[PDB]
Amino acid sequence: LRCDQRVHRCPPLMDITLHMLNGYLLASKAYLSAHLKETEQTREELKNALLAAQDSAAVQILLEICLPTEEDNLLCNLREVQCLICCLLHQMYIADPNIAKLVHFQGYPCELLPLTVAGI
Amino acid sequence: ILLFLIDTSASMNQRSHLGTTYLDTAKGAVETFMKLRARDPASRGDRYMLVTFEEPPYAIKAGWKENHATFMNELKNLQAEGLTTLGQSLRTAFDLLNLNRLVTGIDNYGQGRNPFFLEPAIIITITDGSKLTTTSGVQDELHLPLNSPLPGSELTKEPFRWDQRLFALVLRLPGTMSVESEQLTGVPLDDSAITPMCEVTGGRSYSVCSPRMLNQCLESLVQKVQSGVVINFEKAGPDPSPVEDGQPDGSQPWHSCHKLIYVRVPIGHWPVPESFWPDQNSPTLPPRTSHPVVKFSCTDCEPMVIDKLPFDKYELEPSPLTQFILERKSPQTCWQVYVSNSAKYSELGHPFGYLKASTALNCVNLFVMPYNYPVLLPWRQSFESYLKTMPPYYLGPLKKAVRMMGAPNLIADSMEYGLSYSVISYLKKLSQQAKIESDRVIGSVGKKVVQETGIKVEYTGFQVALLNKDLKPQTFRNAYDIPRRNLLDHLTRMRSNLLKSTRRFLKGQDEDQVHSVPIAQMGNYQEYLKQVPS
């Protein structure tokens, strides 16, 4: 999510990066689950909190990417990128219903409220 | 024993001319009173208690079985928020002071009234100026409520006890300059609703107006703590028969001062039995009085009383000694004293002592005599007929003195009343249970009250949460306690903390220390292989 920042206005590359993000999030979950077993030769709650915070940070970054500009709203690359991000967020919420609650407790700017509700 | 009563009411939030509120000044005055009393080498047995203007479960902050540490900790965190419920607080304090009285034997109400069984207690009742409220309006009477009397309290009919003095501080500090400093050595009265309640017990009520006056009143209050023997005097009935060196004409009649019964527990005998005629069969006992209504008569009546009678030195505190000093302190002469309210079967008062002064003419010695001394002191079947004029139970203590010579009496007629013994152990057990229940839930507050009570104006059961002071959010353990601003940096911090695999991991981000950081406490948990032999 810290790439060249020019792919934000690029639907195909954005979808590729979203697929990679989901894959690497699952890989990080698996890596932590395997690392907590190869240690001490509680920690499970710490790992769960870390994974929840990481998913929440990823969701927040994906939401902040949906911002229009730095300063048509329907026919542009921004629309397709927002739709892809909403699709990934819907998949994440279907996978885990707790990250949605954690993100809503953390909050996000109101400019994304009519987009996530009507997109997810 | 000293029970400080600090209201901590919402009216104690107004700022003085120095810059601190009245509550801060009261706490500072309490601390300086502590450091002043610590100068006298007698503060190794007293115990400090705290009473605030809160609910009965929350009014007491530190009571029995509480050391000085928790008392200072509770007085430190006092918050001034609430109404001025003076009557309920005074009642709670008096009930707290009378928890361990019906179990040890003090005020047994069946065997005289022993003055050598003392439990001193001084109340300060530091409150505001005036305008006390009771959640409905502003009262001007200060009547103590009577809603739930303690088991065994109907035998005194008064909340305070034999030795329970009540001093008061109003803290009437001006807000601009407090420039009233005309009278240097003068401490006037407050003239408020607490003044009669204080004067009834036997203690005055100071009127704090300046910090200098506060220091003066605190330095004058430390000299008014001793054994509590408070008895009331009356002029009746002699019409001021003090025709010894001048002519009488007075205010030194209703003297309700205290007496210093210094020990040599206190040692003494011959107590003031009671004020009524006790019958052999009496289911209900008449309620006693905290202050005995004893009256003196100005008669010489052979003041020379020399015998092997056990001696007593209950020193009387000089408060109304002007009437005695007007007659040259009555040299080599005394005046009898007698308790009223049917001291015998059929008579009005029986002389049982006198108030002879010492040779140094400093104070009154309060020579306490037997129930009827001028007859037994000067057997031809005389003592058997003489022992019928004295109360029955009164044969208890006097016989001990007869033990110094012999033992002619026995336990045949040593019976007060067949009905007085009954219904007494149950009352003592109930009082002990109440004292245990009060001392148990004394520091455990367990408020658990945080809600907004959302009204309609999930239904009828919702309540928004309130801001918790001592929340201690777990940033590493709980993910909900991480705000949005410092989320990525905190995420990396948690990641590095979990992937470090260090020793003795914790869930706190930055927990430096508590409010106190002692040097010896931290140095004790260490090892130093050194002794400095050189």
- DSSP, residue by residue, B475-494: TTT-STT--STTSHHHHHHH
Are A106 and B491 within 8 A, CB to CB?
no
For residue B77, give both structure tokens.
């965190």
CA–CA distance, B438 with B433 (Å, rounded to integer):
9
Smallest Cβ–Cβ distance between A107 and the set B482, B484, B498 belongs to B484
B490 interaction partners in chain A (CB closer than 8 Å)? 53
A105 interaction partners in chain B (CB closer than 8 Å)? 480
* CB-based contacts of A28, cutoff 8 Å, min separation 6: A51, A54
Region for B65 from its dihedrals, namely left if φ exceeds 0, alpha if ψ lies in -120 to 50, beta otherwise: left
Q: Are A58 and A102 in contact (CB under 8 A)?
A: no
What residue type is B500 in one-letter code? Answer: K
Q: Beta B48-51 vs B2-5: how paired, if at all?
A: parallel
Alpha carbon of B526: minimum distance to chain A alpha carbons (Å): 27
Angle (nearest 5°) at CA B480 between B477 and B482: 80
Are A49 and B478 within 8 A, CB to CB?
yes
Question: Which residues share a beta bridge with B5?
Answer: B51
Query: Is A26 within 8 Å of chain B by CB?
Result: no
Task: State which residues form the domain around B74.
Answer: 2-230+426-440
For residue A12, give both structure tokens.
């195909």
CA–CA distance, A71 with B171 (Å, rounded to integer):
62
Interface with A, mutate which of B494, B504, B505 (most A CBs under 10 A): B494
Length reported for chain B: 534
CA–CA distance, B169 with B203 (Å, rounded to integer):
12
CA–CA distance, B236 with B261 (Å, rounded to integer):
26
Are B498 and A46 within 8 A, CB to CB?
yes
The label of the residue with tokens 């049982």 reads B352
Side by side, the strands of the sheet bearing B258-260 are B229-230, B258-260, B315-316
Are B501 and A39 within 8 A, CB to CB?
yes
Q: Give the number of C-alpha atoms closer than 13 A to the C-alpha of residue B443, restricted to the C-beta side.
A: 13
> What is the Cα Rg of chain A in Å?
16
Alpha carbon of A37: minimum distance to chain B alpha carbons (Å): 12
What residues of B are in the A interface, CB distance below 8 Å?
Answer: 476-480, 482-484, 487-488, 490-491, 494-495, 497-499, 501, 505, 507
Are B477 and A49 within 8 A, CB to CB?
yes
Length reported for chain A: 120
Longest dimension (CA), chain A: 59
- Gaps in chain A (C to N over 2.5 angstroms) fall after 41, 71
Interface with B, mutate which of A106, A108, A110, A112 (most B CBs under 10 A): A106
Kind plus residue range of the DSSP H or E element containing B155: none
Are B507 and A46 within 8 A, CB to CB?
yes
CA–CA distance, B217 with B25 (Å, rounded to integer):
14
Q: Are B40 and B85 in contact (CB under 8 A)?
A: no
B478 interaction partners in chain A (CB closer than 8 Å)? 49
B483 interaction partners in chain A (CB closer than 8 Å)? 106
A with B: how many residue pairs have Cβ under 8 Å apart?
49
For residue B211, give both structure tokens.
């910090």
C-alpha B522: how far from chain center: 40
Residue B40 phi/psi, 5° resolution?
-70, 130
CATH no. for residue B96?
Answer: 3.40.50.410
CA–CA distance, A79 with A11 (Å, rounded to integer):
9
Q: Are B445 and B58 in contact (CB under 8 A)?
A: yes
Query: Is A34 within 8 Å of chain B by CB?
Result: no
Within 10 angstroms of residue B442's Cβ, the number of other Cβ atoms is 19
Alpha carbon of A117: minimum distance to chain B alpha carbons (Å): 20
For residue B195, give both structure tokens.
């003044």
Smallest Cβ–Cβ distance between A47 and the set B488, B498, B501 belongs to B498
Alpha carbon of A75: minimum distance to chain B alpha carbons (Å): 31
CA–CA distance, A97 with A85 (Å, rounded to integer):
17
Q: Are B317 and B258 in contact (CB under 8 A)?
A: yes
A46 interaction partners in chain B (CB closer than 8 Å)? 476-477, 494, 497-498, 505, 507
Within 10 angstroms of residue A118's Cβ, the number of other Cβ atoms is 8
Are B487 and A57 within 8 A, CB to CB?
yes
Q: Compare all CA atoms of chain B with the CA of A108 and give the residue at the minimum distance.
A: B484
Q: Compare all CA atoms of chain A with the CA of B507 and give the residue at the minimum distance.
A: A46
Q: Are B90 and B55 in contact (CB under 8 A)?
A: no
For residue B338, give both structure tokens.
């007698």
Are B487 and A53 within 8 A, CB to CB?
yes
Which runs of consecutive H residues, i.e. helices, occur in B202-335?
211-221, 322-325
Angle between helix axes B22-37 and B68-76 (nearest 10 degrees) is 160
